[PDB]
Structures are given as structure tokens and as C-alpha cells.
Amino acid sequence: IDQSLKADPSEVQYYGGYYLRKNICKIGTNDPCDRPPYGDNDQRQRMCINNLEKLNVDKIRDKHAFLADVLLTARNEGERIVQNHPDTNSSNVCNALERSFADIADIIRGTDLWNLEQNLKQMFAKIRENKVLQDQNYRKLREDWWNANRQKVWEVITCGARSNDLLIKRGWRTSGKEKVPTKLDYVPQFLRWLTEWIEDFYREKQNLIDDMERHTSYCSTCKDKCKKYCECVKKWKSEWENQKNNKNWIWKKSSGKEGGLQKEYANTIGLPPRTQSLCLVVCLDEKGKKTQELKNIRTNSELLKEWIIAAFHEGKNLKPSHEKKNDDNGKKLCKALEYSFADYGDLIKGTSIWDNEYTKDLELNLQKIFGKLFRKYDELRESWWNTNKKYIWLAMKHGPTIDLIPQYLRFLQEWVEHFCKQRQEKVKPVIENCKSCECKTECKNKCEVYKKFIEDCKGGDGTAGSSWVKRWDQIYKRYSKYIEDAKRNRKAGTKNCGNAAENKCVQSDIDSFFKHLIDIGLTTPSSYLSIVLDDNICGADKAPWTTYTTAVVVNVPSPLGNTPHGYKYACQCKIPTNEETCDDMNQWSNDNYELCKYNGVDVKPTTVRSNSSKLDDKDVTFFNLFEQWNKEIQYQIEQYMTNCKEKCKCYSLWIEKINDQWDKQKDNYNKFQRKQIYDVVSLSNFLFFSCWEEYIQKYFNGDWGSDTFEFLIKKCGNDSGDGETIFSEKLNNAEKKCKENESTCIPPRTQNLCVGELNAIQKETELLYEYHDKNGLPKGFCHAVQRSFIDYKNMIYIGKLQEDIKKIINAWWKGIEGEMWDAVRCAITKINKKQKEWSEQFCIERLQYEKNIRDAGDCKRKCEEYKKYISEKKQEWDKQKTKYENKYVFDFIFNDNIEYKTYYPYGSLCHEKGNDRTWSKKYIKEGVYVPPRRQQLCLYELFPIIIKNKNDITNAKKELLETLQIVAEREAYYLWKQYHAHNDTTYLAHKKACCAIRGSFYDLEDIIKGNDLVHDEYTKYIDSKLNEIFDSSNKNDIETKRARTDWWENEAIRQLVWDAMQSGVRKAIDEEKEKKKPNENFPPCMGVQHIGIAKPQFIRWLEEWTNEFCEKYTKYFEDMKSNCNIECKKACANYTNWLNPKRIEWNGMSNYYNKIYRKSNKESEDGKDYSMIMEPTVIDYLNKRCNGEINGNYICCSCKNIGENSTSGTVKMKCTEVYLEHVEEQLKEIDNAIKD
């Protein structure tokens, strides 16, 4: 069967993967194919076949690897024949490529006339081992296998060729004047060699007659030389032979005679009618006798004359008859002339994206003309335009301008200008005839006509068949593809001129231009249009292109909206109530349940109904919804307790919404308790547990004293069941928050104070100023008197005075404190007339110690004293950090690891990656959660390196790189030592290990690239110092971030760090002898050195979140299914207590995605580009990513259920009864067995 011969190298996971799918353009036998110009051996048989020459058939995975090897030996010859075939006529480069393809056919099928054949024979023999002898050395097997994979190898040999070709898929002209267009390989190879030879020798004869023109000596030496070889090649005959109409926007592909787009640009941008109606050289009918415009042209002057006269006729065709009285006519005619000039320029240059009946013909004609004119020199055509664009432009303006812009962008600008012309024409009635503040009868239809124009499925009178919205999607798709191609490329940086768009200084190609657009921050078409488009072209309404608008919700830019920006609430003149304004937040909504349903997830009918403890379908659904509601709202209140009048108004409406939602839920739970207990706990005992389990779900992870048990009493319950007042108190606090906002080890000095009696506290502030004095104040004077205030107010060997003052005797103390503040201010004035703290002291002392160390010659003395000082202060900090981190619930300087004391006595060091960490949003600089892998990155050894390089940059690019290598190696080693453990002796273990190591490497790269989203106290200081390392104190955007990116990308470092990662995992593999496991080789998922670009951190964290969520969901679901008495209560409680935080994280990251889904540097709140993200909803994004199997390089997540994350986050029946039994048990525990 044919399907038993067709192969796809994208199938083979790895070689000796998911990269040869749609990206075969750049692709067992480890030997590279190397062996070059065309026609050089005339003094064709020798070709790039070296890869197959050393074919090691032993290490081969079916025929797919063989096809990959053939694809490699075809690509490495196509890319080596495209750039080494001198003809200046792509119709012959095409021929060379097709003849190489035909020679690959012959090599594979064994028909090659001239060690290769043995390897191919054995390969086909082992393929036959895989339909056994149903398709001699397997001649017919070879023929059938070729005829099965004939198309793939052709589209791989034709890749990399210039987007403008003549007979190759990248520009197959029909020449009538998805398949292989040549079908040449079926010709016998002797005939193909004879044709190749005659083409070569006669193109060389043409080159000879050009260089040696017919019109002083040796006027026929080369002619007789060529004739001598023409007689000497007689063996081809008697020797070797015997041995054997107002146009509309097309938007569609070029279907033969009709106009439209060229392929790879079809349905990407529409052709303006002017673009299609452009007068051209061929369309230039001058006189009835066509001879003048026919025949051919001789010199550059004739070509320039044709282009000048065509431009003049275009300008004549581009001016209106009466110009409508020349009032409107003005800048519009000049703009149209500019676009025509640009189109002329890009079609002379040959980088046009539109096609036509005559465009393909004239482009080949221009290639031929430019070849025959500039014989003694692609770049010639662009230079000729850049030199001769002045004359044609001035001819155009008689019927230059900066037009070094990609034709895609100009087409986008013209299409959007037309769209805004129509928009303004149909928005103006709304602006004047209607009004925001005829009240309901005129504005209604004046906005409904606008809606009919906008949501028109036929795309009004601009786009030809799809809605403006759908066509804008095709715009964003193509623009983001351009941006991605510009990002991946490396040879596209600005040219040496010895940011304003420059001609040559700023690099000069499409890729160079898009790299410049990335540099200035325009990575999305909306921002680019907000730049190029002039102000007020879409209406008297200020609807920006960067601000977007909304059973399907479409999120599209403001101009492509159903209603004008601002009139969205005056379309029907609806009440401008603060309610709909506050939407610019919550997500919820008598023997009935007033169910507060999450928008989308409604009531879920339980199907598995068995013997129940009076728990009905509706009761279980309500309990599920209540648990979700009081896990989400109880968190939103604390997350929202932390133009402002509008914010407080919206916030008051928000707290009212939560108040009446809770009022609904109170009655709902009362009904639930009644219907449960009449024939169970209450809100007082549920919300209590719902808080307590937090401490059990965060630091205890599953179930089973002094500074935490009291914290739990003060957090919720107050030693009893008071769930009602736990939540009401925080409701009141949140309610008053914005109203109040709008209303707007002991230190030594504690030893001695102003208690001389045992100027009351006034002599202390004088002696303290005297001590600190040895803006009219020394450094940190206010802090000392502040702590003196704290000590004095806490007061009202030391115990005697507090006891005596207590025997003397708190609003009186408050009055004293106020009078004391007044007296201290008076004391400050009197002094002017005559004219934690331990951390601060330790930091200033350590800075002094660093100065002392750098001031050195007896360096061991000061370093030893520094080390013993740290050792002495360790006891003080041991009792210091806990009391301000355990009571409330830097690290390297007092890291207690032994290996720290071994390697690093200067206050690697990595260790096993504990799996106890969870997802938290801390140190981000909103709504993004840090994965534990990022939280556990090693940066310990980067800290002393940074400290040592104070006021030193010589070692900044030298020592820090070595530290980067060391830390990356240790990170990879420890990740592998913990992820291979996850599944001992399993393939998927090392796959997930590779995924995590790649993620860690990407996060390490982004610590040194742009702004690491996470500002962890290690990376915070690291970036705070290495933005000054690469700084000259000029700027903070181009001086620092661009230089840092150039350091990471172009320096003798990305590859070094990845090689450190590989070396770490190799060390892990070699140290797996105690695991008694095969340490033969390292998994080839780390084999790849170049691993691809890094997508933005939020997207990678989204992928990691999806992977972890789906793996833990499968684990917990299987646990709870296998167990469904203590065996199943644990599974159910674990599932719910893991699902609710994941639902909150899902909602937060979904909101963040919704506000960054297609934004950019100029649009998103952070200066990070998210243009490559292209899906409307996070579910839609993960549906096409987290579906297949993990490969370890590109895919980092696999999931069983993909399109119901929103429903899975809220929901299977008996789980409620076991959860209530668990609640009652944990209650009889925490309320009686721990009470005190």
C-alpha cells in the first residue's frame, strides 16, 4: 500500500522531533553533508551526497530517519546551489534545483549511472523488514518509495530559495503564452545529464559572448577554446550514448488571470483598487502600433524612460476630473501618489506581496533586463531603485517620499485608511444627529446603522467577504509571524553607520525593518497603525487603536467596534449608571436556592446518585458553589484591601455586590442546614474549618504551637465557631478601606534612656542628637528617636522602672504620647534655635567591612575578623528573623548549610529541590503566579561575585560568566536528581526533567535579559547591580537592557550556560551508579544545543501551571476513584483543597491573559512583548498546546481534558458526605483536642 512507503521525519522523536513539522525548511548518520559552485567541473555528477556516503545503517529508526537523512542531503545541496549558481535568471536556478532533485531520485532508486549503493541497498533491505515484498536489490521497492515521498523532498529542496522564484513552488509561473511542478526525474538520467550539460555550456557561451563583445587582441581565443571542447564532447553522441470597473479589495490568492495576493500572503492583506489599477510597463498602450512598447530595451535610459512615463500616466489616472472643487483634494492625492510610488518601487525592486495577470511576467522581464544591463557586477535592483527613484517620483507628482517600508505595512495602512474613511462617514451621524447626554428614537437607529456597518458579515464595502474583525485577525497573524521571523534571525542588526528610522545606518531589509520595529516597541499592527495614522481620521470620537473593545465575545480594537468609543452606553441612551461604568471585579450572581453561579459554570446535575444522608442534587451543587465562592471572595477581599474617586466609587459598588451576595449565601446555607439536619455544621463551623485547613494545606500539606497557634486564633474563630463574624469583620474592613483612603536581642541604646528620675523625655532627644551629630540632620537621626518613641510608649535590669511606674498607676497614656510628640517637636525647635534597626546597623557595618577588605597585604587578618564577626552575629540573627517572619507568617550571609562553610566563607551551595513549594504571587514587577521551579533557582554564588566587583567591570564580563556556568550546572544536576526520582526507571521522568531544566535555563536567561518578572531578593539585587555593570549613566532602556541582551546573545554565553546545564545532567547520569541504573548515555532531549527562542515568562508559567494542574488532577482523580472510610476522605479533601487555589490562579492568570493577549510593549502594562500570543481566551490558547505528548523540547504539558478547565474548576456526589464527615472530624479535633 502507498501509505506504507510515505514517511514523515517529524514522527521520529529524536535522532542520534517536533521541529520537522511545518519547519522542515531548516533541518542516525551523524556525519554532516559537506562537499560546490555550478558548472565548475566543466574542465554534472559531483554533488552533496556525503551524508549518505557514510550511512551507518545500524543506528536507524525505520524509514523515517532515512527520509530525514535524504531531506538533509537535499536541503544542504539546495541551499548550496541557490547561492552558487550564477545566472541572474531564477528560471535557471529553478532548473538546477529540479535537476538536483532528479539526481536524488536517481541516487535513491539505484539508477545512478556512475560505498553509496551498498548502504542504500542495506537500508532498503531493512525497510523491507518493516507489506513484506508486495511493492534485484529491491529496485521496485526503491521506485515505489520514491514515488511515495517524491513531493516531500521537492518542497524541502526548494525551501530556502528566494521568495521570488520562476518555476519553483516559491513562484511557479504557468507560462501559458500542491504538487511537484516539474515531473522531470522520470526522464532517463542520461538525457537529464545531456540537457544539464548543454544548458551549462550554452549559458557559458552566452557569458563568453557578453564578456567578449563582438563589437584589441584574442578576439576569438575563447571562441576557439569553446569550439574545441564542443568537438571534444562528441562522446555524448557516438561514444557514451552507445555505451548504454471600480475595483474592490481582493484579499484572495492569485487564481491565474485574476488579480489578488501571492501565496504565503493570500488572505493576509487586501489589494487597494489603486494598487490593482496601477499603470505598468506592459499595460502601457501608447500608440495603435505596439512596436514602441514592444521589441526590447537596450540600456538603463530606456528602462528609466518606461518607468517615468508609466509613473506619469499613473499620476494622471490618480487625480479626480474636477477634484470636487479642490477643497477636499489636497493631502489625499499626495498620499495616494506616495503609495503608488512605493508600489512602483517594491515591484521594480522585486519584493512585492501582491500578484496580478501582468505582475509575474514583468517581474521576470525586469530580472532579465537587470541581468543583461548590469552584467559586470538582487542588490543591483534595489540599488538601481534607490538611485533612480527620484526621477519617477517627480514624474508622478506632475500628474522624494520616504517609502523604505515593507509592502505588507503599506497595504495595511491603506486598507485601514479606507476602513476609517467609511467609519468616519458612518460615525458622523451619531456624533451630531445623536448625542450622549431624539432621546431614544434617533440615537437608536443612528447607532444601529453603525452596528450594521461594523458587524457586517460581508465586510461592508472594504474587505471582500469576511467581517472587518475576521480580516483584522489575518492582519495580526501575519504581523506577528513577521515579528517572530525578525526575532529568530541574528544577521539583521543595524549596519555600521561609521531610534529614528535611518536608511542604511538602521539596517535595510524587511527583517531589518521589523527588528527596528521590535526595538522601538511596535510588535503589533495596532500600535504600528497608532503611529503611522494621522490624528482624527476615524471620527470626532477619540477611539485609539491600542485600546480594545468587546454568544461569542470578540475582543477587537476600538475602531472595529459595534459602537463609538464612549457612545457604547448612549447607543440606546441607557442610564449612565455607575454599575455599567464599574464594569471597566466579582464573577458570581422559600424552598429555593438563590444560587450565585460563576459566569459560565451553572448548576451541575449530579448523575452518580446513591444512598444519601438527605443530600439532594441541588444541595450538593449549592455546597460546591458555596465552597468555591467563599474560597474566592475571602481571598479577593484581602487582595483588594491593598481618578481615585472613580476607583473608590467602583470599589464601594464592589463591596455592595459582595455584601448582597453574602446575604444570598447566608440564607442559602441556612436552607441547606435545615434540609440536612431536620431529617451537619453551619456557616459558623464551615468558614472556621475553611480557614483552619489553610494552615493545614500550605505548611502541613495533608493532615497530622506558640507563635502560630495564637496566629490561628487571631486569624479565624477566636477559640470557637464564629464563621459569621470571621467574614463580616473583613467585609467591614474592606468596606471602610477606600473611604478612609479618600478621607486622607536588644539594641544597646535600649540600655540607657531618660529614666534618671528612677524635660521628661526631652533630654534624651538632645543627647541622641549630640551622639548622632559627632537638611540640618545627620544620616538616620529620625530613626533613632523613632525607636526611642517606640521603647518609651511600650514602657508606659529595666524591670524595676516599669514595675514602679505601674505601681504609680490607657487613654491617659495616649494623651501623654500626644503631648510628648508635641514636646519633642518643641525640643527640635529649641535645638534648631542654638544651631529593623539591627538590620540597618549590620548592613552599614558590613559596608564598612567591605570597604576595609577592598582597601587591601595582611588581607587574611581583616577577612578572618570579618568571618568571626559574621559567626558572632549569627547567634543574634538566629533569634531575629523568626520573630519577624514566624510571628507574622538576606539569606546568603547566614546560610547554615555545611557546604557553605566548606566552599564559601565570604558572607556550589545548591541542594535537593524540596517539592513542598506552591504557586504564589510575590516579588513580581500584576496577577501572575511564580512557579516553584523559578522560586528554587540557584543564585547563591552570583551574590559574592557581584559584591566583589564593586567599582570593578573588568571581571563583570569574566568572573560572572564563570559563576553563571557553575550555577547552571548545579541547577541542572539538582533538577535531574529530583525529576528522575519523581518516576524512578521511567522514560517520562527524564522528559519532564528536560522540560524543567529548559524552563530554568529560560528563567536564568531572562534574569539577564530585559526585566525578570520576579524580583526575588536574590535576583532583585542581582539586576540592581548588573544594570549598573553595563551602564554609563545615560539611559535605562538602550544603554542597559539592549547592552545586556547583546552580552547574553553575542559574546564569547547562552550556549555556555546551556552547555553547563548539559554538563550538570551528565554528572547526574554518571552519579546514577548508586541508582544501579543504566548510565549508557544522556537522554537526547538535552542533545540539542540550540533549543530555540524564549516565549514570555507569563506564557511559560502558564504552560508549567497547566502541566502541573493536569498531572496532579490525574493523580488525585485516580486516587479518589480508586478509593471511591478514611481512605477516600483524604483523597476527596485533597482534590478540593488543591482545586480551589488552582481555580483562583486560573482566574487571575486568565484575567492577565485577557489584558495581554495581543498587546505589546507600547500597550501592555509591562515593557514585555506578547505579540506572539494570538488566542482570545487562555482555554483556547492551551487547547492547541497542552493536548499532545510531551517531547521535552517544545511541548511542556499534556492533559486528558482540555476544553473544560473552567468547568473542571467548579465541577462526585458522595465526596460531599465524606467531606462533611472530614469537616466534623477536624472540628472535633481543632475545637476540643487543641483548645487551651
PDB file of all heavy atoms in Angstrom, residues 162-176:
ATOM      1  N   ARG A 162      14.866  32.068  -2.758  1.00  0.00           N
ATOM      2  CA  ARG A 162      14.306  33.405  -2.610  1.00  0.00           C
ATOM      3  C   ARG A 162      12.797  33.378  -2.826  1.00  0.00           C
ATOM      4  O   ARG A 162      12.283  32.608  -3.639  1.00  0.00           O
ATOM      5  CB  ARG A 162      14.961  34.371  -3.596  1.00  0.00           C
ATOM      6  CG  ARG A 162      16.471  34.479  -3.463  1.00  0.00           C
ATOM      7  CD  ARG A 162      17.102  34.908  -4.780  1.00  0.00           C
ATOM      8  NE  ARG A 162      16.680  34.058  -5.887  1.00  0.00           N
ATOM      9  CZ  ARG A 162      17.322  32.966  -6.279  1.00  0.00           C
ATOM     10  NH1 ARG A 162      18.440  32.573  -5.692  1.00  0.00           N
ATOM     11  NH2 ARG A 162      16.831  32.253  -7.288  1.00  0.00           N
ATOM     12  N   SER A 163      12.071  34.131  -1.990  1.00  0.00           N
ATOM     13  CA  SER A 163      10.585  34.111  -2.062  1.00  0.00           C
ATOM     14  C   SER A 163      10.143  34.385  -3.499  1.00  0.00           C
ATOM     15  O   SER A 163       9.044  33.938  -3.879  1.00  0.00           O
ATOM     16  CB  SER A 163       9.979  35.094  -1.098  1.00  0.00           C
ATOM     17  OG  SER A 163      10.338  36.423  -1.446  1.00  0.00           O
ATOM     18  N   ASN A 164      10.987  35.060  -4.286  1.00  0.00           N
ATOM     19  CA  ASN A 164      10.662  35.289  -5.719  1.00  0.00           C
ATOM     20  C   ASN A 164      11.435  34.291  -6.584  1.00  0.00           C
ATOM     21  O   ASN A 164      12.647  34.505  -6.784  1.00  0.00           O
ATOM     22  CB  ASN A 164      10.942  36.729  -6.151  1.00  0.00           C
ATOM     23  CG  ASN A 164      10.719  36.942  -7.633  1.00  0.00           C
ATOM     24  OD1 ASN A 164       9.582  37.032  -8.089  1.00  0.00           O
ATOM     25  ND2 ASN A 164      11.800  37.011  -8.393  1.00  0.00           N
ATOM     26  N   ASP A 165      10.768  33.239  -7.063  1.00  0.00           N
ATOM     27  CA  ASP A 165      11.415  32.274  -7.993  1.00  0.00           C
ATOM     28  C   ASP A 165      10.595  32.264  -9.287  1.00  0.00           C
ATOM     29  O   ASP A 165       9.732  33.153  -9.427  1.00  0.00           O
ATOM     30  CB  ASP A 165      11.597  30.900  -7.344  1.00  0.00           C
ATOM     31  CG  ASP A 165      12.664  30.881  -6.261  1.00  0.00           C
ATOM     32  OD1 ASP A 165      13.458  31.839  -6.199  1.00  0.00           O
ATOM     33  OD2 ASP A 165      12.699  29.901  -5.494  1.00  0.00           O
ATOM     34  N   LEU A 166      10.834  31.312 -10.194  1.00  0.00           N
ATOM     35  CA  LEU A 166      10.120  31.368 -11.501  1.00  0.00           C
ATOM     36  C   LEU A 166       9.429  30.040 -11.837  1.00  0.00           C
ATOM     37  O   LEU A 166       8.409  30.081 -12.548  1.00  0.00           O
ATOM     38  CB  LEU A 166      11.100  31.789 -12.597  1.00  0.00           C
ATOM     39  CG  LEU A 166      11.661  33.203 -12.461  1.00  0.00           C
ATOM     40  CD1 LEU A 166      12.730  33.471 -13.508  1.00  0.00           C
ATOM     41  CD2 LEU A 166      10.552  34.237 -12.562  1.00  0.00           C
ATOM     42  N   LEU A 167       9.958  28.914 -11.357  1.00  0.00           N
ATOM     43  CA  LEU A 167       9.372  27.592 -11.705  1.00  0.00           C
ATOM     44  C   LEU A 167       9.332  26.729 -10.442  1.00  0.00           C
ATOM     45  O   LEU A 167       8.822  25.594 -10.517  1.00  0.00           O
ATOM     46  CB  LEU A 167      10.230  26.942 -12.795  1.00  0.00           C
ATOM     47  CG  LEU A 167      10.255  27.659 -14.144  1.00  0.00           C
ATOM     48  CD1 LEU A 167      11.249  27.008 -15.092  1.00  0.00           C
ATOM     49  CD2 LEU A 167       8.869  27.683 -14.766  1.00  0.00           C
ATOM     50  N   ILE A 168       9.856  27.253  -9.331  1.00  0.00           N
ATOM     51  CA  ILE A 168       9.869  26.510  -8.037  1.00  0.00           C
ATOM     52  C   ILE A 168       8.590  26.895  -7.286  1.00  0.00           C
ATOM     53  O   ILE A 168       8.051  27.969  -7.599  1.00  0.00           O
ATOM     54  CB  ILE A 168      11.175  26.854  -7.283  1.00  0.00           C
ATOM     55  CG1 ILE A 168      12.417  26.531  -8.118  1.00  0.00           C
ATOM     56  CG2 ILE A 168      11.259  26.265  -5.884  1.00  0.00           C
ATOM     57  CD1 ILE A 168      12.520  25.078  -8.522  1.00  0.00           C
ATOM     58  N   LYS A 169       8.103  26.046  -6.370  1.00  0.00           N
ATOM     59  CA  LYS A 169       6.864  26.326  -5.590  1.00  0.00           C
ATOM     60  C   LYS A 169       6.821  27.783  -5.099  1.00  0.00           C
ATOM     61  O   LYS A 169       5.704  28.336  -5.053  1.00  0.00           O
ATOM     62  CB  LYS A 169       6.719  25.332  -4.433  1.00  0.00           C
ATOM     63  CG  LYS A 169       5.453  25.467  -3.600  1.00  0.00           C
ATOM     64  CD  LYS A 169       5.363  24.462  -2.474  1.00  0.00           C
ATOM     65  CE  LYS A 169       6.393  24.693  -1.389  1.00  0.00           C
ATOM     66  NZ  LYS A 169       6.173  25.979  -0.687  1.00  0.00           N
ATOM     67  N   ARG A 170       7.965  28.375  -4.727  1.00  0.00           N
ATOM     68  CA  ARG A 170       8.021  29.801  -4.302  1.00  0.00           C
ATOM     69  C   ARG A 170       7.929  30.711  -5.530  1.00  0.00           C
ATOM     70  O   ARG A 170       8.821  31.555  -5.688  1.00  0.00           O
ATOM     71  CB  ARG A 170       9.326  30.082  -3.553  1.00  0.00           C
ATOM     72  CG  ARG A 170       9.718  28.986  -2.574  1.00  0.00           C
ATOM     73  CD  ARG A 170      10.962  29.357  -1.800  1.00  0.00           C
ATOM     74  NE  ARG A 170      11.001  28.744  -0.481  1.00  0.00           N
ATOM     75  CZ  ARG A 170      11.124  29.420   0.654  1.00  0.00           C
ATOM     76  NH1 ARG A 170      11.220  30.738   0.629  1.00  0.00           N
ATOM     77  NH2 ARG A 170      11.148  28.779   1.807  1.00  0.00           N
ATOM     78  N   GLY A 171       6.891  30.550  -6.355  1.00  0.00           N
ATOM     79  CA  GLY A 171       6.708  31.378  -7.530  1.00  0.00           C
ATOM     80  C   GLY A 171       6.608  30.638  -8.849  1.00  0.00           C
ATOM     81  O   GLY A 171       7.206  31.056  -9.843  1.00  0.00           O
ATOM     82  N   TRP A 172       5.837  29.547  -8.857  1.00  0.00           N
ATOM     83  CA  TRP A 172       5.645  28.764 -10.105  1.00  0.00           C
ATOM     84  C   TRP A 172       4.827  29.583 -11.107  1.00  0.00           C
ATOM     85  O   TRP A 172       3.602  29.711 -10.908  1.00  0.00           O
ATOM     86  CB  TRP A 172       5.022  27.390  -9.808  1.00  0.00           C
ATOM     87  CG  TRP A 172       4.274  26.756 -10.944  1.00  0.00           C
ATOM     88  CD1 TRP A 172       2.928  26.543 -11.015  1.00  0.00           C
ATOM     89  CD2 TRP A 172       4.820  26.244 -12.174  1.00  0.00           C
ATOM     90  NE1 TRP A 172       2.599  25.946 -12.201  1.00  0.00           N
ATOM     91  CE2 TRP A 172       3.738  25.749 -12.933  1.00  0.00           C
ATOM     92  CE3 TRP A 172       6.109  26.160 -12.713  1.00  0.00           C
ATOM     93  CZ2 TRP A 172       3.912  25.178 -14.192  1.00  0.00           C
ATOM     94  CZ3 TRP A 172       6.280  25.595 -13.956  1.00  0.00           C
ATOM     95  CH2 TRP A 172       5.194  25.111 -14.685  1.00  0.00           C
ATOM     96  N   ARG A 173       5.486  30.190 -12.095  1.00  0.00           N
ATOM     97  CA  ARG A 173       4.743  30.875 -13.184  1.00  0.00           C
ATOM     98  C   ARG A 173       4.220  29.807 -14.143  1.00  0.00           C
ATOM     99  O   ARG A 173       4.974  28.860 -14.440  1.00  0.00           O
ATOM    100  CB  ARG A 173       5.642  31.850 -13.947  1.00  0.00           C
ATOM    101  CG  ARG A 173       4.900  33.041 -14.538  1.00  0.00           C
ATOM    102  CD  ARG A 173       5.685  33.757 -15.620  1.00  0.00           C
ATOM    103  NE  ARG A 173       4.809  34.466 -16.542  1.00  0.00           N
ATOM    104  CZ  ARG A 173       4.951  34.469 -17.862  1.00  0.00           C
ATOM    105  NH1 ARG A 173       5.944  33.799 -18.422  1.00  0.00           N
ATOM    106  NH2 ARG A 173       4.102  35.142 -18.618  1.00  0.00           N
ATOM    107  N   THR A 174       2.979  29.959 -14.605  1.00  0.00           N
ATOM    108  CA  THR A 174       2.375  28.989 -15.514  1.00  0.00           C
ATOM    109  C   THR A 174       3.016  29.055 -16.894  1.00  0.00           C
ATOM    110  O   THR A 174       3.276  28.017 -17.514  1.00  0.00           O
ATOM    111  CB  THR A 174       0.867  29.225 -15.606  1.00  0.00           C
ATOM    112  OG1 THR A 174       0.264  28.965 -14.332  1.00  0.00           O
ATOM    113  CG2 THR A 174       0.241  28.308 -16.647  1.00  0.00           C
ATOM    114  N   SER A 175       3.289  30.267 -17.381  1.00  0.00           N
ATOM    115  CA  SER A 175       3.877  30.492 -18.702  1.00  0.00           C
ATOM    116  C   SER A 175       3.020  29.852 -19.797  1.00  0.00           C
ATOM    117  O   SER A 175       3.484  29.041 -20.600  1.00  0.00           O
ATOM    118  CB  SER A 175       5.321  29.982 -18.756  1.00  0.00           C
ATOM    119  OG  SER A 175       5.756  29.819 -20.096  1.00  0.00           O
ATOM    120  N   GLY A 176       1.745  30.237 -19.811  1.00  0.00           N
ATOM    121  CA  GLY A 176       0.821  29.736 -20.813  1.00  0.00           C
ATOM    122  C   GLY A 176       0.913  30.429 -22.154  1.00  0.00           C
ATOM    123  O   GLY A 176       0.199  30.036 -23.084  1.00  0.00           O
TER     124      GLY A 176
END
